[PDB]
């Protein structure tokens, strides 16, 4: 008779579930991982059966923790995944994740003929192999057999929900990650379907994130430890949910998350695409569009620098301590952070990192700090593509392990020159999934109400003096990036 | 029993070496003197201080033996500039090659096409180290002292003048003023007129082997020598370091890398570079020193040793770098930390690591520094020898070249044998040799080989040489990409 909501987050490498009480308070969480399938270089698949097994296990463990009813289970999910089902609804492929680069040549050719540009103009999908549309084109050319027998092309969230309810439905924000969803109609682009040789019937139907998918099959009602009145809430993408999950529900705010990798995002009231296709535009509904830049080179690069500049015994705190002994701007040392190639803002998979501007004045602290500043400059570079000459947002709602320290929080404030707002809850995705459930159940109505759950913790205002230093130094960062932009192909 | 003293009048210190009659060094002594840096770019020294050190050293060396000093010969720093007044007293300190006062004057001359003209005429690269540019600067902003200067000379000239009363320079030293005409081997009249300087205000020019006599009696006593002790005019450190490693003709190259570095070769006629990337300094009618002075040698190694790593010894650094593959997984290090002269001639240059990946760990970065220092020297050497036959070997010296590792690396990158020398002190050795020529004890320059012996030889490993041959174009691509970006870091 006490009611609860479970929010699920179906990520690459692991799913996390959070159990929330009817006041929105998290009362427990459980997560379980699965291996990535990387036989060959560029390969990045996972077994949908394993993921679904983790899902049942997580939900069961959560329900074991309480004596009450699960009113709803809502979903946040990785984007861009692709799975083929045959006519018997059986798996024809693994889940081909966003990180699989099998379509990389397909994209390059599309880019040369002006096709990738057209897909971007139609769907808001950047010219990158992560998209289902490019993977489908690759499959159709190089794996004719499976392409022939595929009757459904879906993502992992659709797969999971299908196993639970026998229904095949995707939400708008997830269709937004296929590269097939038309920005203006918010249904599949007919021209692109024709080129794909895919029929609308071979794709899930599109509904709103709050749609209740009912009923769950009795089998799984038992296995999951739930009621026959437990609802499935369709849910949404991790990108969208992570954004509203930090209360960045409109264009006055941006969401900056930086963990191993990073992302800058904002929600606008109409489709808006970039002439240089430097950021994605993923619809959420007719009056909300998610703009953003996924950025590879976040804390993963901080980690590389920590181990390389020092040694594998240097703590993150030790590194930060040393970096802080250099002046703001690192005496003009520039670090381009593109260690793993880069998506936003430069969209060059061959890019590599650089230190430029060294002199005998640059000692360890200058190099350490340049790394941190470069990481943030890169993010500000991506953010600046979004904003352009529009209203600067009045705050950046910030999360992620790279932004743990006050030093980095303040540095972001100083470089972005807007206040940085940290959040009480880092698990923004399950939180916002939980919120969609509350909407479906009639417990909340307007989106803005998520603010009561997604609460702000600390605010960091730009220090005017340092902000000026960084404002003068950013153009030099861009000069060095520009100078080297055409030089990366050489390294390989 | 007769001995010869070879003197090396360097920046910050002078070193004397006493050689016996068979060219064997039997003792040495050195004395330092402060650099005068009141402001940025300034690099002066007090010539009286230097001359004091010279006397002490010579006296100290004489106190080490029972015999005669047959001769005292000179190897000297280049590009120094001292002005004397009508009373012959110092109007200025020795303004060394490192002094930057004339940097603006050079930039302007370079824009007007005059700096190019100076290079065409004299073989002097477009750089403020040159007396000619320092004179132009003085003429326009130190007009007082410019007005009263009756003699413009260098430190070697000052010393010999104090000892002897005679103002004499040798060809190799004249070659470093930026006023000596390549074709005539005398002061360039057109340049003299622009400077508004009369041939009389400059030392006479003589052969490096010319005996200057007599020595003033006051110094014969002070120095501990004889009335027949000969002063040999001597020559520049650059020229003497080259013949002092037995690199006497175009079939050889001299590579020295200590704190800084230099690549040099001697050819039989004037040769200048369309891009002016190397100097051409006459020694005589049929011998011209081509070279690149390279700032970023062991000084950059030392920076990396401390910055990348603690208190790593040089050997630890070497050990770590050797755990990286040849080519450092294609990581490029442009080593221009202190700006650069040869080969890029950009005082605003800075260093870079370009091509970083998570594959690049401490070993790759350490190794890329060493490869980059060497690539930079190979870049400068390549300017020298283009459109010519490669030298048959590189004659190598310097603390940076101490380890077999770096020696072998030089072989692999240059793709020519590296011959290391028994004698690192090439300058005073060649200075001593000059004295032997003047004393009649040697005739042909080629006989310097009897004294400057090879110690070891390193032959290119064809496998690694191939690797580096493929990597050098990438090093140049990155250098080229960034060449125009340095002015922005001010
Ligand atoms: N004190 C610190 N300052 C800056 N960065 C740090 C610090 N400590 C750890 N990191 C970085 O934080 C990163 C991980 O961030 P995070 O904790 O948000 O995990 P994630 O894997 O990116 O996302 P999630 O665990 O929610 O799935 C690493 O890449 C690491 O180098
Ligand atoms: N084992 C080594 N390997 C490479 N470089 C070294 C090594 N040891 C010292 N160095 C470098 O040697 C240089 C000095 O060269 P050296 O010829 O001995 O002195 P100098 O140029 O002042 O006459 C320094 O700049 C230092 O970093
Ligand atoms: C080829 C390789 O190095 C990969 O790690 C790849 O480049 C991924 O980079 P992007 O996600 O930016 O295209
Ligand atoms: C020392 C510093 O100020 C640098 O600018 C350096 O002096 C460059 O001089 P070079 O012209 O010899 O490269
Ligand atoms: O484009 C995106 C979302 O911003 C991808 O990088 C994410 O990894 C999806 O899970």
Automatic annotation (TrEMBL), chain A:
Pfam families: FGGY_C (PF02782), FGGY_N (PF00370). The keyword Transferase applies. Residues 255-437 form the Carbohydrate kinase FGGY C-terminal domain. This is Gluconate kinase. GO terms for biological process: carbohydrate metabolic process. Residues 4-245 form the Carbohydrate kinase FGGY N-terminal domain. It comes from the Bacteria. SUPFAM superfamilies: Actin-like ATPase domain (SSF53067). Belongs to the FGGY kinase family. CDD domains: ASKHA_NBD_FGGY_GntK. Keywords: ATP-binding, Kinase, Nucleotide-binding, Transferase. One of its GO terms (molecular function) is gluconokinase activity. ADP binds at residues 260, 299, 401. It comes from Lactobacillus acidophilus (strain ATCC 700396 / NCK56 / N2 / NCFM). The keyword Kinase applies. It is an enzyme of class 2 (transferase). Its EC number is 2.7.1.12. Signal peptide: none annotated. ATP binds at residues 260, 299, 401.
């Amino acid at each position: 008779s006490l009611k609860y909501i479970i929010g699920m987050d179906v990520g690459t490498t692991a799913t996390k579930g959070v159990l929330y009480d009817i006041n929105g308070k998290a009362v427990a969480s459980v997560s379980k991982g699965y291996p990535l399938i990387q036989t060959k270089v560029g390969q990045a698949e996972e077994d949908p059966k394993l993921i679904f097994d983790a899902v049942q296990e997580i939900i069961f463990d959560l329900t074991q923790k309480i004596d009450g009813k699960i009113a709803a289970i809502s979903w946040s999910s990785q984007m861009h995944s692709l799975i083929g089902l045959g006519s018997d609804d059986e798996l024809l492929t693994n889940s081909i994740t966003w990180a699989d680069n099998c379509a990389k040549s397909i994209v390059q050719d599309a880019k040369n003929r002006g096709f990738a540009q057209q897909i971007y103009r139609k769907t808001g999908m950047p010219m990158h192999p992560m998209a289902p549309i490019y993977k489908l084109l690759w499959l159709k050319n190089k794996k004719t057999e499976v392409f022939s027998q595929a009757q459904k092309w879906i993502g992992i969230k659709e797969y999971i929900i299908f196993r639970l309810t026998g229904k095949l439905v995707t939400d708008t924000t997830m269709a937004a990650g296929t590269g097939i969803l038309n920005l203006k109609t918010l249904t599949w682009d007919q021209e692109l379907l024709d080129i794909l040789k895919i029929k609308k019937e071979q794709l899930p139907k599109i509904a709103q994130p709050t749609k209740v998918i009912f009923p769950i099959k009795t089998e799984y009602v038992k296995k999951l430890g739930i009621d026959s009145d437990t609802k499935i809430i369709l849910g949404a993408s991790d990108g969208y949910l992570s954004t509203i999950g930090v209360n960045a529900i409109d264009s006055d705010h941006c969401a900056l998350n930086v963990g191993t990798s990073g992302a800058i995002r904002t929600i606008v009231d109409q489709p808006k695409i970039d002439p240089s296709a430097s950021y994605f535009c993923y619809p959420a509904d007719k009056t909300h569009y998610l703009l953003g830049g996924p950025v590879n080179n976040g804390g993963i690069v901080f980690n590389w620098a920590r181990q390389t500049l020092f040694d594998a015994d240097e703590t993150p705190q030790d590194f930060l301590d040393v970096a802080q002994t250099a002046p703001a701007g690192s005496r003009n040392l520039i670090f381009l952070p593109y260690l793993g190639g880069e998506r936003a803002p430069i969209w060059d998979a061959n890019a590599r990192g650089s230190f430029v501007g060294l002199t005998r004045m640059h000692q360890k602290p200058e190099m350490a700090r340049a790394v941190i500043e470069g990481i943030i400059f890169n993010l500000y570079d991506a953010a600046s593509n979004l904003i352009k000459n529009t209203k600067k947002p009045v705050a950046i709602n910030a999360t992620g392990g790279f932004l743990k320290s006050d030093f980095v929080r303040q540095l972001c404030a100083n470089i972005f020159n807007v206040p940085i707002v940290t959040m009480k809850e880092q698990q923004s995705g399950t939180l916002a999934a939980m919120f969609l459930a509350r909407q479906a159940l009639g417990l909340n109505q307007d989106l803005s109400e998520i603010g009561q759950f997604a609460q702000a913790d600390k605010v960091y205002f730009p220090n005017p003096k340092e902000a000026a230093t960084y404002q003068k130094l950013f153009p030099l960062y861009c000069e060095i990036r520009n100078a080297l932009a055409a030089s990366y192909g050489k390294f390989s």
